[PDB]
Amino acid sequence: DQPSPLRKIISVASIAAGVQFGWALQLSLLTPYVQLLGIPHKWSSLIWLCGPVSGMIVQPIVGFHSDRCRSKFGRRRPFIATGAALVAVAVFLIGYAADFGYKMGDKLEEKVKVRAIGIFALGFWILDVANNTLQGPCRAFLADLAAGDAKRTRVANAFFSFFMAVGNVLGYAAGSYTNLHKMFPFTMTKACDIYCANLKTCFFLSITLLLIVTVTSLWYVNDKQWSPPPRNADDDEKTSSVPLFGEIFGAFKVMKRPMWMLLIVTALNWIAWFPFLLFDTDWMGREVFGGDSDGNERSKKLYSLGVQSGAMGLMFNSIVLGFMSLGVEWIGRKLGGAKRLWGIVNFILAAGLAMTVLVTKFAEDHRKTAGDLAGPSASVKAGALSLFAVLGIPLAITFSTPFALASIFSSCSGAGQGLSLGVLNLAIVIPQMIVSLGGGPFDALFGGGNLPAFIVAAIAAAISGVLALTVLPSPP
C-alpha cells in the first residue's frame, strides 16, 4: 500500500505507443494488400470477425491466470513479454505472406492466391491472440503500481491513452508515406507490390519501436513476485470449472453494484462509438465525396479520394486525443468527479454524430449545383475534418476513465485487476460484433446510406451521458 513512483507508472504506460503503432500502420495499407492477395470478401469478413471473438475468449482467461501467476518475474511481465514476442512473429508472417505463397505454388495471373491467404490468416490470428494477451496485464500492472491510490490510477490511464494517441500519429504518418520502401530496396519482388513493400517497411519500424519501448519498460520496472494464501482441501479455488465461461460467470457473481453499472455505461458508450469508427471512411467516400467502389471510373476515383481524406480526419482526431489526454484528470477533478466529465463529453459525442446529417446535406447541395461527379468543395472538406477533429475530446475519456474506475472498484472490493479488466472488455467487443453484423441491415431497414446508424448512435451516446451522471456510483 505504498505507491511506486510516477516514473515507473509512465514507463509501463509507454508500451501503448508500440502496440498502437502496429495497428495504426494498416489503415491505408491493408486494403491494397487484400486486393493484391485477392481474398474473397466473405473470407475477409470471417478473418476480421476473428478479432472480437478472440477478445471474448483470451481476455478473461489471461486475466484470471495472470492474477494467480506466482512466477518469479511477476504477475504481469511474463504475459506482456510473450505478447510482444508473438506480435513480432505475427508481423513476420503477415508481411511476407505473398512471397511465401508465390514461392509455394501461387500463380501471378490468378486472382485468389490460396497459400498466401492461409499465411495471412495465421498471421492475424497470432496477432489477435498477442494483443489480447498483452492488453489486460498491462493496465493491471498500472493498477498494481498505484497500490490503491485513486488519483494515481486515473493519471496512469490518462497517460495510457496519451501514448495510444502517440502511436496512432506515428503509425498514420508511416503508413501513408509512399516511397518508404526506399529504406529497404529488396522489399519489392515479383509477387510484392509497392504497397506491399511499404507494409514490410512499416512492420520493420513496428518491431523496432516495440523492442525499444518494451525491453526498457520491463527491465526498468520491477514486478513483485506474488504469493498465494494457504488453502484447505475443501476450497473452491483449487476446484476446476467450466473452461471459458467459468472465469466470466465467476467474475459476474462476485460482482458489485458499481461494476454492473460501469459495464452498462461502457457497453452503451461503445454501441455509440462503433458505428462511426467502423463506417466513417465509407461515409466520407460515399455520402460526402460522391461515388461508389462499383460503377464508372470517376466514381471509384472519388471513393478512393474520400477514403484518403477520412484517413487525414483520423490523423487530426488522434492529435486532439493526445492533447486532451494530458488534461483529463485535472479537468475531471475541478468539475467534481471523473464521471461528471464523462457525462459531459458524451453529449459532445451526441452532437457530433448529429452534425453528420448537415455535412451530408451541404455535400448534396454542392453536388447539385456543380455536378454529381464534381467532388466536394473546400467548405465540405473543412467541415468533415472539423467534425473528425472535435470528436477527439470524448474519445480521450473513453480511452481512460472506464478502465480507471474498474481498477478502483476492484481495489475496493478485492476482485482482481486482470480479470476485472478482461470482463470490462466484453462491454467493448460485444457492441463491436453487434454493430459490425447489424449495421448494414439496420441502415437498409431505414432507407439506406450511413445516417440511420449515426442517429441511433447519437441517441445512445446521450443515454450513456445520462446514465454515467445518474446511476453510476462514485468511487470511495
Numbering used by the authors: 25 to 500
Article sentences:
Sucrose import from photosynthetic tissues into the phloem is mediated by transporters from the low-affinity sucrose transporter family (SUC/SUT family). Whereas the SWEET facilitators efflux sugars, active loading depends on SUCs that use the plasma membrane proton motive force to drive uptake of sucrose for accumulation, with concentrations reaching as high as 1.3 molar in the phloem. SUCs are part of the Glycoside-Pentoside-Hexuronide (GPH):cation symporter family that belongs to the Major Facilitator Superfamily (MFS). SUC1 is predominantly expressed in reproductive organs, trichomes and roots, where it localizes in the plasma membrane and is required for proper pollen function.
Here we present the structure of the sucrose–proton symporter, Arabidopsis thaliana SUC1, in an outward open conformation at 2.7 Å resolution, together with molecular dynamics simulations and biochemical characterization. In the asymmetrical unit, SUC1 forms a non-physiological inverted dimer, with both monomers in the same conformation (root mean square deviation (r.m.s.d.) of Cɑ atoms = 0.1 Å). Overall, SUC1 adopts the canonical MFS transporter fold with twelve transmembrane helices arranged into two pseudosymmetrical halves consisting of two six-helix domains, the N-terminal domain (N domain, M1–M6) and C-terminal domain (C domain, M7–M12). Extracellularly, a short helical region (named extracellular helical region (EHR)), which also has clear amphipathic properties, is present in the loop connection between M5 and M6. The EHR is anchored to the side of the N domain by a disulfide bridge between the strictly conserved residues Cys216 and Cys220. The structure captures SUC1 in an outward open conformation with a conserved electrostatic network between the N and C domains at the cytosolic side. A large and clearly defined V-shaped cavity, which spans approximately two thirds of the membrane plane between the N and C domain, is open to the extracellular side. Overall, the cavity is electronegative, but it becomes electropositive towards the enclosing bottom. Despite the presence of sucrose during crystallization, no defined density for sucrose binding can be observed in the cavity. In the transmembrane domains of SUC1, the only acidic residue is Asp152(M4), which is strictly conserved in SUCs and therefore the prime candidate as the proton donor/acceptor residue during symport. Asp152 is exposed to the cavity solvent without any close contacts to other residues.
